[PDB]
Structure 1
Amino acid sequence: QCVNFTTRTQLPPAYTNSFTRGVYYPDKVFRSSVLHSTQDLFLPFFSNVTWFHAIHKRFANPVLPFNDGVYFASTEKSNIIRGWIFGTTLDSKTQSLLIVNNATNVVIKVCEFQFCNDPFLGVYYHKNNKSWMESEFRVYSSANNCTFEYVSQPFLMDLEGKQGNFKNLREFVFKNIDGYFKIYSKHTPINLVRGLPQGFSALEPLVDLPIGINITRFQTLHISSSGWTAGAAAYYVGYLQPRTFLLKYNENGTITDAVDCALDPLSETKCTLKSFTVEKGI
C-alpha cells in the first residue's frame, strides 16, 4: 500500500501525431453555411501530444501542468477513466476540485480529501449476474471541510464490456477563462483497430462551472497489494495555445472542416482571403 510497484517506471513525454483534433464550437451562436474566423485558446493542428498506453508491468501516472490549457483524449473500451483531480497543491493542504462521472451523473465536490497512496475501486464475485455494479470505494476513507458541492444532470454512459472493434471514443476540452470553467465534450462511435481513425469531428459543450479556483496542475485516476494491476487503457494530453481557426459550417450547422491559419503557409493564404479555395498567386 505504502510502497509502489517494483516494476513501476516513469515514462518520458513521448510524442505522436494529432491531425484534425482540437476543433470545437468556440461560442454559443448558431450559424449555417458561412465561414467565421475566431480567436480563442485552441489546440494547433499537426502538433505533438503525449503518447501513453497500457498493455499486458508498467504503470505511469505523472503530474502535468494545467497552465496554458489542456486537451484530454481517451480511447477506451470499458471506460477506465472515471474522472480527474484538479487543484494547485492537489492535496489536503489547499482546496482541490474533484469531478467524477460514475456513468449516472457527474459528481463535483470540493473538500479536504485524505489521500491514499493507491486510489482505485473493485468489483468482486462477478461470476453470476455480472452487471458491473460498484462494490467497494477504496479511494478516500473520509472527507470534511467542504466549501463546494454540485451534482450534475443524469447522463448516459455504457460501462458494459464488448467484443470487436473499439466501440467508444471520449473527447473532452478543459479550459478556464477569467475564472469561468468551460467544459467541452464529444462522444461518437468509430471503427478502429489500432492507432487513431481517419476522420474529422467537432466537440459540443457540456457544463459551465463558475467555480474560479486557480489550477496549475491536474491528475488522472485509474479504476478498473502487489497482485492487483491496471488494465489496458490509453489517454492523450494536448496543450492549448491561443491560435485562430477558419471554421466551415455546412447546411446543418455542424463543423465539417477546419483550417488553422498559422499552421502552414497555404493556410496562411486561406486565412488572409477567408476562403477554402485560394486562387493562384503571391
Structure 2
Amino acid sequence: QCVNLITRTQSYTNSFTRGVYYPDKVFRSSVLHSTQDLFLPFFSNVTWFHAIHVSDNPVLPFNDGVYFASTEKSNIIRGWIFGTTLDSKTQSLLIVNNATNVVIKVCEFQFCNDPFLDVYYHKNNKSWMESEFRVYSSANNCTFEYVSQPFLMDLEGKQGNFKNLREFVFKNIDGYFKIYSKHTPINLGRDLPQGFSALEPLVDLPIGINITRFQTLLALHRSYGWTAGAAAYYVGYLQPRTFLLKYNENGTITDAVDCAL
C-alpha cells in the first residue's frame, strides 16, 4: 500500500502573537522574565497549506523546532511523522491519535512514500477502525511506546462555524522531544486571531533520536473508495530568539515582547 494520491497547495499569512509557550516548568507571579530559546517571532510570515484528495505532497523540513497550527472539525488531522530518514535506515517517531487514545511510537519504520491513515467501517467487526496501515510496510525493532489521552479534543456541543484553533510547538533537544500545545475557541473571526495565549507543555519525551524532517497524517473514511475531502494547516519555524514574558498574579504568561521585532 503506497497510494501517492493526496496533494497540497500553499499560500502565506501573518502569525501576529502566536507560538509563545512556557519555557520551563516554573511558576512566576506578576514578574517580567527574559529568556533566549527557540521561539516563533511576532508577525512572522507563516506558510498556509491546503491538503486535498482527487480521484505534489512534499515532505516538510524540521530545524530548531516547528510551530504547527490547524482548526479542523471531526479531528480529520490525525498525526505526525518526525525523523531522520523515514525509510527504516535510521529510526523515526510516529504520532497517531483517534477519539479515545494517542500513541507515541518511535521505530525503524519503512514509510513508503506518502503516509495517510485509513479508518473505515468493517462489516465483520460491525464498526469503524483502521483497515491496513498504508503509512508503512512494517516495523522492525521498536525501543519506546507510550499511550495517553488524545492531544486534541473538540468543544462540548458544537456551535455553528465555531472552530477551535489547535496550536502545537515541536522541539528536539538533548535526546528529548517536547510537545507544547493550546486549543483556543474562535469566534469564526479570522485565522490566528488577535489576542494572546501561551502553549502548555503536554508531553516531554526521552525519545533520544535524531530529527531533520517531518510530515502530517490526514484520515480518509474509504466510503464506497476514498471519498474526497479537504483540510488546512499553518507551519512556522522557530529561531534562537530572545523574549520578555509577562506573568499575571496566577502565573499564566498573559503577554510577551519579541525582543527584535
Q: Normalising TM by the smaller chain, what interval?
A: 0.7 to 0.9
Distance (whole Å) between structure 2 residues aligned to residue 196 and residue 23 of structure 1: 13
**Contact 2:19/2:167 (CA < 8 Å) preserved in 1?**
no
Deviation at 1:42, TM superposition (A): 0.7
Q: 1:193 and 1:107, CA in 2 relative to 1: closer, same or farther beyond 3 A?
A: same
Say which one has the larger Rg. 1
Q: How many residues align?
A: 256
Q: Which residue of 2 aligns with 1:258?
A: 256
Q: 1:158 and 1:195, CA in 2 relative to 1: closer, same or farther beyond 3 A?
A: closer
Q: 1:8 and 1:102, CA in 2 relative to 1: closer, same or farther beyond 3 A?
A: closer
Deviation at 1:193, TM superposition (A): 4.9
Q: Which residue of 1 aligns with 2:18?
A: 21
Q: 1:92 and 1:165, CA in 2 relative to 1: closer, same or farther beyond 3 A?
A: same
Q: 1:17 and 1:147, CA in 2 relative to 1: closer, same or farther beyond 3 A?
A: same
Distance (whole Å) between structure 1 residues aligned to residue 193 and residue 199 of structure 2: 16
Deviation at 1:8, TM superposition (A): 7.4
Deviates more, 1:203-212 or 1:248-257: 248-257
**Contact 2:97/2:151 (CA < 8 Å) preserved in 1?**
no
Distance (whole Å) between structure 2 residues aligned to residue 6 and residue 63 of structure 1: 12
Instruction: Tell me whether 1:176 sits opposite 2:190 in the alignment.
Output: no
Deviation at 1:30, TM superposition (A): 0.3
**Contact 1:170/1:188 (CA < 8 Å) preserved in 2?**
yes
Deviation at 1:196, TM superposition (A): 3.4
Q: 1:230 and 1:160, CA in 2 relative to 1: closer, same or farther beyond 3 A?
A: farther
Distance (whole Å) between structure 2 residues aligned to residue 160 and residue 129 of structure 1: 29
Q: Which runs of 5+ in 1 are unaligned?
A: 263-281
Q: 1:110 and 1:6, CA in 2 relative to 1: closer, same or farther beyond 3 A?
A: closer
Deviates more, 1:145-154 or 1:101-110: 145-154
Q: 1:42 and 1:162, CA in 2 relative to 1: closer, same or farther beyond 3 A?
A: same
TM-score (norm 2): 0.81
Deviation at 1:103, TM superposition (A): 3.2
Deviations 1:69-100 (A, max 9, x none): 21111111121111111111111222111122
Instruction: Tell me whether 1:196 sits opposite 2:216 in the alignment.
Output: no
Give the match's secondary structure for 2:194. coil
Q: Which residue of 1 aligns with 2:155?
A: 159
Deviation at 1:2, TM superposition (A): 5.5
Deviates more, 1:34-43 or 1:193-202: 193-202
Distance (whole Å) between structure 2 residues aligned to residue 7 and residue 83 of structure 1: 17
**Contact 2:12/2:47 (CA < 8 Å) preserved in 1?**
yes
Distance (whole Å) between structure 2 residues aligned to residue 103 and residue 225 of structure 1: 19
Deviation at 1:190, TM superposition (A): 1.9
**Contact 1:103/1:159 (CA < 8 Å) preserved in 2?**
no
Q: 1:181 and 1:120, CA in 2 relative to 1: closer, same or farther beyond 3 A?
A: closer
Deviates more, 1:101-110 or 1:202-211: 101-110
Which structure shows the bigger proportion of residues in strand conformation?
A: 2
Deviation at 1:165, TM superposition (A): 1.8
Q: 1:178 and 1:228, CA in 2 relative to 1: closer, same or farther beyond 3 A?
A: same
- RMSD, matched Cα: 4.0
Q: 1:219 and 1:79, CA in 2 relative to 1: closer, same or farther beyond 3 A?
A: same
Deviations 1:253-282 (A, max 9, x none): 2222111111xxxxxxxxxxxxxxxxxxx9
Deviates more, 1:173-182 or 1:235-244: 173-182
**Contact 2:8/2:51 (CA < 8 Å) preserved in 1?**
no
Give the match's secondary structure for 2:256. strand
Deviation at 1:150, TM superposition (A): 2.2
Deviates more, 1:127-136 or 1:251-260: 127-136
Q: 1:162 and 1:130, CA in 2 relative to 1: closer, same or farther beyond 3 A?
A: farther
Distance (whole Å) between structure 2 residues aligned to residue 134 and residue 3 of structure 1: 16
Q: Which runs of 5+ in 2 are unaligned?
A: none
Equivalent pairs: percent with the same residue? 96
Deviation at 1:112, TM superposition (A): 3.3
Deviations 1:225-270 (A, max 9, x none): 99635522111111100111111111222222111111xxxxxxxx
**Contact 1:86/1:98 (CA < 8 Å) preserved in 2?**
yes
Deviates more, 1:93-102 or 1:118-127: 118-127
TM-score (norm 1): 0.75
**Contact 1:87/1:216 (CA < 8 Å) preserved in 2?**
yes
Q: 1:174 and 1:35, CA in 2 relative to 1: closer, same or farther beyond 3 A?
A: same
